[PDB]
Amino acid sequence: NPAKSASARGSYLRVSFKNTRETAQAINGWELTKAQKYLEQVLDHQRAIPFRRFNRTAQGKEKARWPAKSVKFVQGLLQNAAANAEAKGLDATKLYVSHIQVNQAPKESSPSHIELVVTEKEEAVAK
Amino acid sequence: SDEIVWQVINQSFCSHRIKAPNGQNFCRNEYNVTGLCTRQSCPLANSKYATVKCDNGKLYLYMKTPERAHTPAKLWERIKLSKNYTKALQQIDEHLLHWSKFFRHKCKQRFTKLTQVMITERRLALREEERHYVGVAPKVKRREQNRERKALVAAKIEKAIEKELMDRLKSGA
Amino acid sequence: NKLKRQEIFADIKHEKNKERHTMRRKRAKEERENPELREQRLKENVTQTIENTRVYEDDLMRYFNSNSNEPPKIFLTTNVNAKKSAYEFANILIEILPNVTFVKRKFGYKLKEISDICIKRNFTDIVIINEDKKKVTGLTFIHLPEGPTFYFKLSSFVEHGRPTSHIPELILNNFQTRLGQTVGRLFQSILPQNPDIEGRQVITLHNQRDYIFFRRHRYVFKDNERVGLQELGPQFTLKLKRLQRGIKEETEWEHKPEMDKEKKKFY
Amino acid sequence: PKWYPSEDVAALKKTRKAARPQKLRASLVPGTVLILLAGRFRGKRVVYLKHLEDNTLLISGPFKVNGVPLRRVNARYVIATS
Amino acid sequence: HPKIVKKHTKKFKRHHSDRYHRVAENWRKQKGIDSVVRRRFRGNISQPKIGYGSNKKTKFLSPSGHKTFLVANVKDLETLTMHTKTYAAEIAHNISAKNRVVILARAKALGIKVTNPKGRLAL
Amino acid sequence: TWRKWNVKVNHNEKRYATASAIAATAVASLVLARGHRVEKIPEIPLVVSTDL
RNA sequence: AUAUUGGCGAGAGACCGAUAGCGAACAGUACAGUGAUGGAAAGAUGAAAAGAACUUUGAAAAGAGAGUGAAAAAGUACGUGAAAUUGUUGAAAGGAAGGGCAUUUGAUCAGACAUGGUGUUUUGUGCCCUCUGCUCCUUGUGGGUAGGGGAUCUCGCAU
RNA sequence: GCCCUGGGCGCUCAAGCGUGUUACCUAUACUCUACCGUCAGGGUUGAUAUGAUGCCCUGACGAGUAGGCAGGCGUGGAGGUCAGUGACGAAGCCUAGACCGUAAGGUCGGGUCGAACGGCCUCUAGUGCAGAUCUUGGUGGUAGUAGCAGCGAAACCACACCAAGGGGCUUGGC
């Protein structure tokens, strides 16, 4: 439902495709504020981003790494999505990343296109 | 002659033949009793022929003889068929007296089929079918689909409903 | 040369984006110290949305619509040779319409015969859904006296809460135009006219350009003077058509494919 | 009846199959008690009254004893007691 | 009509048509002598042969019992007047919806069965 | 460029073909099968005055 | 009178169609070689630029709104967008997979605007009865078309 | 004569051995029937209640390398014909849709697409791909690895732990 969701897209970025995909998977489905806090902690090396497909530490209990370069772009895109939602007048607290995808961009380095969508959780329902 | 004409139309690209996937050569000529381009059925391959055709509601028994082959402008004569079925059948039989049984049978079958085709009148009498067949162009379909989505996106029905409810219950309870 | 054209414009767009970003940053920074300048610039720059660029009786209501003095009986049927989808839609029609009687199509009783029988039974309106494939495509509503009727196209039919037995509240939006308020009056006279607010059930009709969105929601208020709502199941959009103004005679507004070129006037 | 065939569908040949009365098995005799193997009254005990011309058996529960009314039944779905 | 006994309903597929994407599903006989399919070893895909020939009395007849006949216009449709039971009018995919309604009206008037009615039409 | 383009035809056979084509025009049924709308010609072969 | 793959200027092709046709449809150009020499890749937006005014997040990439436009599922990476390949949702299944014979379960698609035919009984009509006409050939077991009078009428149609 | 000395699971009045008498399972083997085609014969009109190049009856036959013969599917272009199809949508493409044929393929149902293409008799050939350590262009595992928090390949690529019988199908197990 467009009336309850916001979108943000980044194309032709130079971040590593595999690392970006791992970061997106590690953040898919998380709450917007919680996702931002997790990314900030990752930048602080307190938590690590799991690498389940493209690959041993205690941080991986929740095989992990700290892709700072990819995380920077991921958090920038998340901030852009939050700004779009604010422009749309959505409730930031209820916002959660419902869709996130990475696509290989034209070729050298391996650029990729990253797009994410945030949707408002349904609550306050009664007879 | 008929044999030369028959073989030329058969093996030398008759213009009005149609080839069905089943392998039957059809004949869309208006003057043929049967729509099959076989011998003794195609009017061009036989000097003597008989068929039933109609322009107005009246049905006519069309036949030709070698007396008019040299004059195509007067090739086919016609007679009112006396659309009473019982009278029409006997009139056709009398007109085709001494003709080949194939021609008589085919003419009778064609006349009966054309007479029973009057079901069109039955459907016309039982008119007022409200389905009203309508064709949708691809361009028209594109307009509704995308513009409807744009209107839904711009409408923001939830916000309007919330605003109306807030304005309604302010002094409505 | 393709390479020359692509290269020239590729660099041009990058420079244009750089200049735009720098100008926006400088404007924001200078406006932070001069808030009024931002307001003046916003006033001097209108977004020019399509909505902002739109290109420019009590007797009638009683005579051609139902009134509270007598609840309206609505006759519900389906076009001949109907199938499961039509009956499934008729189920929702029963669930939403006040007083409905379902009768199988007899395939031969003319529209005049149906109207005469309905008059004999004191029916108020006739509603018939029509299908081509296994999907609903159009809906019609006709009033018995004087035969005012409307035909609606159906699209985007989608089946999350369970509606209660309470009668939903009726709200109409964007029916300012004379033609629009006629459909609004039709909806206000075909749907229940007696609200039972207790139970927080609401039914809304929202037209934007030409399509009207019908949805049901539960509404709960909070101390913040705002009301939240939750989807109550089906999604519905309709498009008015053929505006017959009679049973089948004297069409007044019947839509034509040649329209919609103007992009505006939102009939 | 009177409409000439608008399409000459070939007529059927003279079938040499004369109808014959059903030759019921000797075990089936009037007044025999019958057990129904299928249908609404499956498993009920029924009395054999009369043979019908449609290859069915006219039977009765009797209706008063077990509620089975006069109905047609096929000999192949019935077991004949002694 | 005689029963339409389909000797082989399953569509024949070329050997390895699914193992490699470069091999089209269109049937092609194996030419190598060592090919197992050519020797029709047990368990291999069935090879088309004269045995699967359909009978003439039911060949080309659709399950409805009417033979398909492509129709381009009213003139072509009128040719099936004497063969309505045996033949059915099929509208070509390139026929615009404008002429489709006219063709369907004539078919209904003549009682000719339509294999793909209502195509491109809306009610 | 030295591929064969023209086909040698016996003059007698060429005259035979022309004569056969001319004769074929005398049959209305054969002409009708050719696709010409000659259904209304007063006479076949069509003869007109030299003033044409 | 004879030759003519160079030059200028013309008329044509059962010729080829951007991996073809001259190497070059936008090149003997970029490029490599001290050098003689070799030698490419690249066509199409959209009717027209009407080429996204304006708001808004970003040092920068470009995003979200908004609108132009028949279409932006045509946004100068632009006539159309399939495979190999890659990421997401869903279903399924788990030191392998792939195909054939027969079937269950799950999902899912078709599945007659068929609504008839026959004999009987009222009523209104016509090409039906009767009177009076006109018109085409040839001449014929015809066709076309008019003006007065009714329901002897089922000769057809509609009830 | 037998018993010790010289396929697995399994069995001992055997489920082992020799002989004797009956019940049964099957292969494309054989009988009949249902259908496709080849061959051989025959029927056919003062014209056929469907192209004498048509509609039929009868019997047998049907493997196959090289090779020979016959009947067809598809494409570029050309002569002819459909007073063909088509902005109310031609071609192409997609399609866990359907129909037709033994198949080359044709046709129709739904989505993108936009402006040309096709039903049929002939002529014409730069006419049909599964490979040629094949050419152009494109993309994967190798691999986020070797290597130089970040950047980042190359070779190679039909396919993926063992016991016995048999070069990596039979019977089983880490």
UniProtKB/Swiss-Prot annotation, chain A:
GO terms for molecular function: structural constituent of ribosome. The modification Phosphothreonine is found at residue 57. It is found in: Cytoplasm. The keyword Glycoprotein does not apply. There is a cross-link at residue 37 (Glycyl lysine isopeptide (Lys-Gly) (interchain with G-Cter in ubiquitin)). Its main location: cytoplasm. GO terms for biological process: cleavage in ITS2 between 5.8S rRNA and LSU-rRNA of tricistronic rRNA transcript (SSU-rRNA, 5.8S rRNA, LSU-rRNA); cytoplasmic translation. Keywords: Cytoplasm, Isopeptide bond, Phosphoprotein, Ribonucleoprotein, Ribosomal protein, Ubl conjugation. The keyword Amino-acid biosynthesis does not apply. GO terms for cellular component: cytoplasm; cytosol; cytosolic large ribosomal subunit; preribosome, large subunit precursor. Component of the large ribosomal subunit (LSU). Mature yeast ribosomes consist of a small (40S) and a large (60S) subunit. The 40S small subunit contains 1 molecule of ribosomal RNA (18S rRNA) and 33 different proteins (encoded by 57 genes). The large 60S subunit contains 3 rRNA molecules (25S, 5.8S and 5S rRNA) and 46 different proteins (encoded by 81 genes). uL22 is associated with the polypeptide exit tunnel. There are 2 genes for uL22 in yeast. Belongs to the universal ribosomal protein uL22 family. This is Large ribosomal subunit protein uL22A. The gene is RPL17A. The chain holds residues 10 to 159 of 184 of the full protein.
UniProtKB/Swiss-Prot annotation, chain C:
The keyword Transcription does not apply. InterPro entries: Brix, IMP4/RPF1. Residues 14-37 are annotated as: Disordered. Residues 72-249 form the Brix domain. Residues 227-244 are annotated as: RNA-binding. Residues 28-37 have a biased composition (Basic and acidic residues). Essential protein. Required for biogenesis of the 60S ribosomal subunit. This is Ribosome production factor 1. The gene is RPF1.
Swiss-Prot record, chain D:
GO terms for molecular function: RNA binding; structural constituent of ribosome. It is found in: Cytoplasm. Keywords: Acetylation, Cytoplasm, Isopeptide bond, Phosphoprotein, Ribonucleoprotein, Ribosomal protein, Ubl conjugation. N-terminally acetylated by acetyltransferase NatA. The modification Phosphoserine is found at residue 6. One of its GO terms (cellular component) is cytosolic large ribosomal subunit. One of its GO terms (biological process) is cytoplasmic translation. Present with 37100 molecules/cell in log phase SD medium. There are 2 genes for eL6 in yeast. Component of the ribosome, a large ribonucleoprotein complex responsible for the synthesis of proteins in the cell. The small ribosomal subunit (SSU) binds messenger RNAs (mRNAs) and translates the encoded message by selecting cognate aminoacyl-transfer RNA (tRNA) molecules. The large subunit (LSU) contains the ribosomal catalytic site termed the peptidyl transferase center (PTC), which catalyzes the formation of peptide bonds, thereby polymerizing the amino acids delivered by tRNAs into a polypeptide chain. Belongs to the eukaryotic ribosomal protein eL6 family. This is Large ribosomal subunit protein eL6A.
Swiss-Prot record, chain F:
It is found in: Cytoplasm; Nucleus. Disulfide bonds: none annotated. N-terminally acetylated by acetyltransferase NatA. It comes from the Eukaryota. Belongs to the universal ribosomal protein uL4 family. There are 2 genes for uL4 in yeast. Component of the large ribosomal subunit (LSU). Mature yeast ribosomes consist of a small (40S) and a large (60S) subunit. The 40S small subunit contains 1 molecule of ribosomal RNA (18S rRNA) and 33 different proteins (encoded by 57 genes). The large 60S subunit contains 3 rRNA molecules (25S, 5.8S and 5S rRNA) and 46 different proteins (encoded by 81 genes). uL4 is associated with the polypeptide exit tunnel. uL4 interacts with its chaperone ACL4 and the nuclear import receptor KAP104. The eukaryote-specific C-terminal extension harbors a nuclear import signal and delivers the ACL4-uL4/RPL4 complex to the pre-ribosome, triggering uL4 release from ACL4 and incorporation into the 60S ribosomal subunit. This is Large ribosomal subunit protein uL4A. It comes from Saccharomyces cerevisiae (strain ATCC 204508 / S288c). The chain holds residues 105 to 156 of 362 of the full protein.
